Paper text:
[name], a member of the conserved TMEM16 family, plays a central role in the initiation of blood coagulation and the fusion of trophoblasts. The protein is inactive under resting conditions and becomes activated in response to an increase of the intracellular [name]+ concentration. Fungal TMEM16 structures have defined the general architecture of the family, where subunits, consisting of an N-terminal cytoplasmic domain followed by a membrane-inserted part composed of ten transmembrane helices (α1-10), assemble as homodimers.
This residue is located on α5 and does not line the predicted pore. Differences in both directions are found for mutations on α5, which constitutes the center of the subunit cavity. On this helix, point mutations of residues Asn 562 and Tyr 563 result in a two-fold decrease of the EC50, revealing two positions where sidechain truncations strongly destabilize the closed state. A dataset of the mutant in detergent, in presence of 2 mM [name]+ and 0.01 mM of the lipid PIP2 (N562ACa), allowed a reconstruction of high quality, showing two populations of the protein obtained after a 3D variability analysis and refinement of the two end states. One population, containing 62% of the classified particles, displays C2 symmetry and was refined to 3.01 Å. The absence of asymmetric conformations in datasets of F518H obtained under equivalent conditions further emphasizes the gradual stabilization of the active state, which is more pronounced in the case of the mutant of the residue on α4 than observed for [name].
Author numbering:
A (entry chain A), B (entry chain B): 43 to 81, 87 to 149, 187 to 196, 202 to 223, 228 to 427, 445 to 488, 503 to 587, 591 to 640, ...
Write the structure that this text describes.
Amino acid sequence: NQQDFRTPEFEEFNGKPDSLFFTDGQRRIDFILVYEDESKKGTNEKQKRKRQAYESNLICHGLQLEATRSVSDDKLVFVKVHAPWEVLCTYAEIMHIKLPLKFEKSRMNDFYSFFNPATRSRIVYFILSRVKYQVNKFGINRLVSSGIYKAAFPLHDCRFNYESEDISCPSERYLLYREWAHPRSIYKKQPLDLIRKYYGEKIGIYFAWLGYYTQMLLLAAVVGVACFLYGYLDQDNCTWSKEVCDPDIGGQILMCPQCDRLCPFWRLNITCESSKKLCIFDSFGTLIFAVFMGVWVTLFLEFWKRRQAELEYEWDTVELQQEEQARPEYEAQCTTCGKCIRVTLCASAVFFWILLIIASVIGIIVYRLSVFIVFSTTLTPQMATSITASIISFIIIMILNTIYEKVAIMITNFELPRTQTDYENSLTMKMFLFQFVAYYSSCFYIAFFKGKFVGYPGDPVYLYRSEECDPGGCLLELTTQLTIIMGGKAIWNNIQEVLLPWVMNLIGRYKRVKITPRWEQDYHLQPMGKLGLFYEYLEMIIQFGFVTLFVASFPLAPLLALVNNILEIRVDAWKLTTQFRRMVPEKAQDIGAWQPIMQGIAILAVVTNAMIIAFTSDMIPRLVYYWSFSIPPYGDHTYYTMDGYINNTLSVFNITDFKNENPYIGLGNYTLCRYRDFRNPPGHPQEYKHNIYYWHVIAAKLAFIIVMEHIIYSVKFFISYAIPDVSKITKSKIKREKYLT
Amino acid sequence: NQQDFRTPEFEEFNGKPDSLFFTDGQRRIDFILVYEDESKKGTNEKQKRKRQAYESNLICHGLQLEATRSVSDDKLVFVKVHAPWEVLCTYAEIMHIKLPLKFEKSRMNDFYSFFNPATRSRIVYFILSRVKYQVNKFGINRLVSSGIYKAAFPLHDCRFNYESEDISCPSERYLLYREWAHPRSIYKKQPLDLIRKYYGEKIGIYFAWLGYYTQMLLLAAVVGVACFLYGYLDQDNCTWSKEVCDPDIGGQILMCPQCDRLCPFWRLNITCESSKKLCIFDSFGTLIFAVFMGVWVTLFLEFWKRRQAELEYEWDTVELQQEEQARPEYEAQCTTCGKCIRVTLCASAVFFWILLIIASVIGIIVYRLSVFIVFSTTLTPQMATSITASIISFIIIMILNTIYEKVAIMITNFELPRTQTDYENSLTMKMFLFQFVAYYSSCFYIAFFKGKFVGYPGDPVYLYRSEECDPGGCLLELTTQLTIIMGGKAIWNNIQEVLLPWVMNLIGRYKRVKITPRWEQDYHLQPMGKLGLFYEYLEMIIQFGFVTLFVASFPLAPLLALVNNILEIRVDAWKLTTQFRRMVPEKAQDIGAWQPIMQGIAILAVVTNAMIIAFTSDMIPRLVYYWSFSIPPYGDHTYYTMDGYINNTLSVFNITDFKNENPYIGLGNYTLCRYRDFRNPPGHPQEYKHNIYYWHVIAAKLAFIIVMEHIIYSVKFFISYAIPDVSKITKSKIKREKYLT
Ligand SMILES: CCCCCCCCCC(=O)OC[C@H](COP(=O)(O)OCC[N+](C)(C)C)OC(=O)CCCCCCCCC
Ligand SMILES: CCCCCCCCCC(=O)OC[C@H](COP(=O)(O)OCC[N+](C)(C)C)OC(=O)CCCCCCCCC
Ligand SMILES: [Ca+2]
Ligand SMILES: [Ca+2]
Ligand SMILES: [Ca+2]
Ligand SMILES: [Ca+2]
Ligand SMILES: [Ca+2]
Ligand SMILES: [Ca+2]
């Protein structure tokens, strides 16, 4: 318990470049602790005292340590840490590790190189965290946080690209780089058992979840492509789009200006090309695919639960949960009311940043309003404005995202979660809320609040001059925004993931920090961090939200996500294998709070899709016209039809503007202009007021919302009730295990 | 394992009337087995052989048996069964019973009359079920089912009304009859710990759940009475009801006949008294109470979960679940596809009975249509018809309920569930489905399908002549039906529960089957049955459905349920204590599938209340008129108001009937009659067609449904997320137990 003897067999050796064993080679390296001591104000002496005390306690606990001087930096010292068989057995009895038994699985010790390097490293890390050094001080995490130990990490088997020089060593890292984690193997299956063996249950479960997600996205994308091709082949029969394109009918419709000044009365001809591709995106194919996706999200969740149960059986992810140690930062600072006030203050700051991104969205709105005029003066101008606004909003969101990552780390540090699990949960909720708002605010605005509250040309709604939507609807604009944001986020995240660790390693090599041992080689790598796969999970959950929430706009979102996931598996695996220092294996029976987040997103997706179809799409007005306003009571046709829809939907407007300006007279010489609304024509007893057609349409929209929501929720409940969360084969295997044992 | 020696100390004694011990009095009675053997075709010999083998096996296992001849029936033999201390200890080690420890609680045996009579009986019953007698035969349940043993049951402490003759015996039954299970103690608290000690965890958890349910109903009823009194005090300001009552305005409205023949054109005056009491039942008070109940159901569920966790800690309801034995009926008969086909056939039969009760509802509809004419020819006739139909439907439902109980037992016997738990689950789902349909079909019809599809007087909707609703709405009729069904079911169930066991015991005494011992006294009692509190749970769940689903009609449903529960606690406790043979204690950590049923009812209640308020109540039309049709654009009043609502809502009808009969001319000499619909007046370009007012009203109804459902579901989610399911005190106690142990 005191610093008496530390660091035996202190001897420098680098002749063996690829070896995970000690100088004698009898016992392997389970951990590496990196420090430096030769080079003020007594701090060096204090750190030396504390480190010597910790090393003495470690050796007293039974571990074997051997330190070598770095061949490059004379001040760096690497301490290789190995655990004897007796220590491994006793600390595997302390924490109930399941081992192969004659391949049955059971508790602390079984009957049967016996411990894999991953579990050896896990046991050694548990010992390092438990052993005290000193008031009381707990373990190695506090030493690392205090700068006493520069690093502490396990070792990789070998170089990822080259086979290990040692022949008895199975080059698992090389195999995982060759048959995995490499674009050359982009098509092969994932060796989930092997990657679990090499990295741990957390990484294994993440990669299994990603693979299952890709598998389900394959089915969703196939069905979406089927619906999209149905809509594409029915393009020749778009009655309303053909009518818009027709100069005889759509050409004679003079739409009123959108802005007050310097915007001409424009004919509907300029909307022909956009209408052609819009008819594909708002059709019965997209409606059927929205219903199918409502079913498919439930299928995805249920089958992931079944796969998770299967993996819980096969990998034994359920271990006894020992009391989680308090974080060193929390324990350094140690009333309850004050900490509650601090939590409320942190939440206030987070909602302040949410208000900031909302203000950014409002700024984008103002940019659209200001730039439409210059686009018109100088590929219709409205489409160009929409595309440019989408690009600018995407860039602004991406720029804000990194700053929010930094300040979210700052905020979660300012508040004090005692355990790493509490830190992870708080960061999860905070980060997910901000990412949700930032990445979905513009899409939600385009879907639900763009063009909905504008009024008629007389007495328009001012904020100033709220955005008016296109006569065909804003579903095309929403689809463009979704494509831009989703594809750009995917590409940008992949580029950042590939480059940032690689660039950091390259600059580390350039700073000169030839033959070098394994501990040095792995030390010259970027640490993954205390969080781990948090950002990978967050990215995948954001992609899932994009796929599910706005699937009613275009059916190709599952296909885009499928391509993104096929690339994502390989990029994540490659960076984890090559560019990052090895992490201590953990145990995880699920994905964490991300699964409740996905369940909430699944519940919200039904409402979002129903409201998208009802409000942002013109399908309900078209159906209402076809079934009720082409018949004799309100129309002239003998049978149900869609012709005349454009002429009978748009409302007339004689030029009589309220003086509460009248810019139409200054902007043109025309007398009657048509606007996309369902108000009464001029000369009516109640002119410019909502009419029977408007109320019929809105009643149909609300009835569709109610019917779709209730039917889809009922079907989801029935499917969840019908599908058992545990597979029959897994049940049989569990019963066999219980019977044998 | 063979019948060699059975039934030691076979000696008849009845001198001690109140004693739970053997003839020597040293060891107590843990069980009683009743049989008879002296009195064909060799069956008596076969049963004698099997019973002797079972008794020999019982004695070999360590139990002590002593049989006495019945003092009344010479053929009846009672076998008292006692377990020695060693047998109790070994079979308490086999199944991990938690015992007091120095009062901490822990596993099979602790350090400290030691076993309560309840747990002694539970251990002895476990032994009886496990011991084999014989192909292989399992235990005592098969013998009882086969008629070998006439009965097998534990004993009560004493007579419920008289203190036990023995002085060392704590008369727990007498105490539980004096301070509980008695109307004289209708106001006192429930000794939950004492009743759990005497009966078991199942009975204890049921009574605790009932008490908590009553406690929450108290709050719900107080709030409902507040809202009801608000509506009652605002009765003097009901503008529309006062207008209806006014002969100057409501008296001049001539409503068209409802039936085709022999129904007069009737003035709205006859609706004045019903409108007066309807204004109380459809108001903002009832709306606010519906929202409050939406919150209150979530509060109820969350706090019941917290109370359940507290009881799990305090009573140790979580025991190790040994493998449940197969039912004797299932094991007597022992492919999978055939049994699946049988299950589908049984489900088809159940849905057939559901169709039968639906046909009964249709018959009630036909009865109303046929009897309104005779009521009019011979307390307005429509109200009299509604009340009589409610009474008849209630009687028919009650008559069908018992027959369905019998045939549901038959169906669950026809299908083969291997375990009693599977039997309980299947019977639960089947019985709950039928009870739901039977008790809610008429209410759902009145709420959602009565008067909704009738058309206008020209071209009315025929099935024939679907029921037309009152001008004020059918919320009053729904409230009357709810009051009738709920109160009648409560009274009828209480009367049946009180009388049926008591009547059976009385007729058993009358059939002569004076001083008698404890085993005979308890044998002359009605057995509870293998199900137990299944019907009590079902009754309470049906009452909960009545309270929650239709709470938007009248706010006094929680008060009625509160009175019913205050009576129900005492009646259930009294019958369980006095009229029923004692049951073996069980262990239960919750109420079972009834909790998922309650969660489903809670989810459905939001939709049901929103749709009730929107469709069956006139609040939405009144609000729409006030805010949009009393203003100059559609009305003449300068400010928002409600006057003129009756005259401006009802639609006119000139007498021009389609010849697709024309009975109006034969039934009266009038020319213009007003009907409750929002169609255009005669002479309009599109007359007798839905108008802008109708579409505005329906759009408002659907918007209200959407807004209310989404807001209430969001609030329920937030409340469930905010409330932790485990109380802080229970968490502290669990942490203290973990720290000490
Ligand atoms: C819960 C997460 C998602 C929430 C999304 C909320 C979206 C709300 C959208 C909304 O209220 O939009 C306005 C609607 C529909 O009016 P539209 O007929 O689409 O507007 C006409 C536009 N025009 C003048 C160019 C012809 O105007 C109405 O009359 C609709 C009133 C009913 C709203 C129901 C939604 C309430 C949700 C809580
Ligand atoms: C889920 C468990 C509960 C289900 C309850 C379903 C209730 C359906 C009721 C229904 O559709 O009723 C017809 C509605 C109401 O219009 P009303 O104005 O009440 O009908 C005319 C009545 N009058 C001639 C005497 C003036 O007329 C309409 O146009 C309503 C159409 C919108 C129906 C939305 C509900 C769909 C639920 C799945
Ligand atoms: Ca990526
Ligand atoms: Ca990633
Ligand atoms: Ca399921
Ligand atoms: Ca009752
Ligand atoms: Ca009862
Ligand atoms: Ca909760």
